């Protein structure tokens, strides 16, 4: 009726009901469990030697005993090497961030247990700012590696959706506190389930993340003018926001500090921005825009590569414009 796994780092055990939560046509998530064992197999790189002699790649998951030969034995044969829990060497420190392969598995696993009907995410007004789309694991990993977040930056995702972007950032960056705000009620409802489920599968592997908060709200409100300007790095997926609210975001971004980073789907400033007397109040005056390297499967609504752009606030460009306006 159920089947249980035990944590290596002493956390609460897991639950898998025998009326299985099959999700798509064929991933039929016992593949979730047999791949969950393989990441705890090397944490701790000695489950492969502790469990070589009897197991092999096995089909026929429709029987209850095929998991049962694998799962309670995993609750049992863990103690062939867990038994060193006392006396001379502790297990792994909880202050470890996961690898990119482990983090990809946890974020896929937290997504499967959280969203129940992903076709509900398509319930929006057409061509509105509230359309839904996602950024893949590979672009956010590109985004984290091509900004350089120090130990004092603050990350905010405007329009966080279900919140999978801030979970990858909070588990791959040593910063203070991260935020995500979402207006639409359907992905913000899944974001609360996504919030709880990320934490309990994070102590289960025994890994730390930075602290975060997923909120409901509208970032175009007066509460958010003060706290957009006080953050260091901003992620936003503005692909279908439209020009009326992209114009509103520019006059919130104009109060950011020096070295303020902005990663967006569409640019807030041209790549070939020439400054003259006609566009001195534009936001491209005070920022430098570069296009990141595009990768395959970068977004979730199309298959072709969509490239996101990087914005860096510097108020040393308009001065260099003013440093050649005087002597001729």
């Amino acid at each position: 009726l159920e089947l249980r796994l035990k944590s290596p780092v002493g956390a609460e055990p897991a639950v898998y009901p025998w009326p299985l939560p099959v999700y798509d046509k064929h991933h039929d998530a016992a593949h979730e469990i047999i791949e969950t064992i393989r990441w705890v197999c090397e944490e701790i790189p000695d489950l492969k030697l502790a469990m070589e002699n009897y197991v092999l790649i096995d089909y026929d998951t429709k029987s209850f005993e095929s998991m049962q030969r694998l799962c309670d034995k995993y609750n049992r044969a863990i103690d062939s090497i867990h038994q060193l829990w006392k006396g001379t060497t502790q297990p792994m420190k909880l202050n470890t961030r996961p690898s990119t392969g482990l983090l990809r598995h946890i974020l896929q696993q937290v997504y499967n247990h959280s969203v129940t009907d992903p076709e509900k995410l398509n319930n929006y007004e057409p061509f509105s700012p509230e359309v839904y789309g996602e950024t893949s694991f590979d672009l956010v990993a590109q985004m984290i590696d091509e900004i350089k977040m120090t130990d004092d930056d603050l990350f905010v995702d405007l329009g966080s959706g279900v919140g999978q972007v801030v979970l990858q950032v909070a588990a791959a960056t040593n910063c203070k506190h991260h935020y995500g705000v979402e207006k639409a009620d359907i992905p913000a409802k899944y974001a609360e389930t996504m919030d709880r489920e990320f934490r309990k599968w994070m102590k289960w592997y025994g890994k730390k993340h930075a602290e975060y908060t997923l909120e409901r709200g509208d970032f175009l409100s007066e509460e958010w003018r003060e706290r957009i300007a006080n953050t260091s790095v901003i992620f936003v997926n503005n692909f279908a926001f439209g020009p009326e609210v992209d114009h509103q975001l520019k006059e919130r971004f104009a109060n950011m500090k020096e070295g303020g980073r902005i990663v967006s789907s569409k640019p807030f400033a041209p790549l070939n921005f020439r400054i003259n007397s006609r566009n001195l109040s534009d936001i491209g005056t005070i920022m430098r825009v570069v296009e990141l390297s595009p990768l395959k499967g970068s977004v979730s609504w199309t298959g072709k590569p969509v490239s996101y752009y990087l914005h860096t606030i510097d108020r040393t460009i308009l001065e260099n414009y003013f440093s050649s306006l005087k002597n001729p």
């Binding site: 020009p243 009326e244 992209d246 114009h247 041209p270 003259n276 007397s277 006609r278």
Partner: protein
């Protein structure tokens, strides 16, 4: 008592190139340019109000007529230029 855009084209030079001029032969080409894209945008926005059985041309019909007529990056920066002027007109 005949009108043109020559006063207004000459103001846009001094913002862009503050120490160049135009000849009068090329000012007349700039007046032919402004009248041409006036009747392209207003002609396409007239059909958009008629396809949807509306009787009013608003700033939304001008916006989607710009997106039909201008190519690529011209349409991106004319839409952001037009929405900046409308939101400044309605907040003043």
């Amino acid at each position: 008592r005949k009108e043109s855009y020559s006063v207004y084209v000459y103001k846009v030079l001094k913002q862009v190139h503050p120490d160049t001029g135009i000849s009068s032969k090329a000012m007349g080409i700039m007046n032919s340019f402004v009248n041409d894209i006036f009747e392209r945008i207003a002609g396409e926005a007239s059909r958009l109000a008629h396809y949807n059985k509306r009787s009013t041309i608003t700033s939304r019909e001008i916006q989607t007529a710009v997106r039909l007529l201008l190519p690529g990056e011209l349409a991106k920066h004319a839409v952001s230029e037009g929405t900046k002027a409308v939101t400044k007109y309605t907040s003043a």
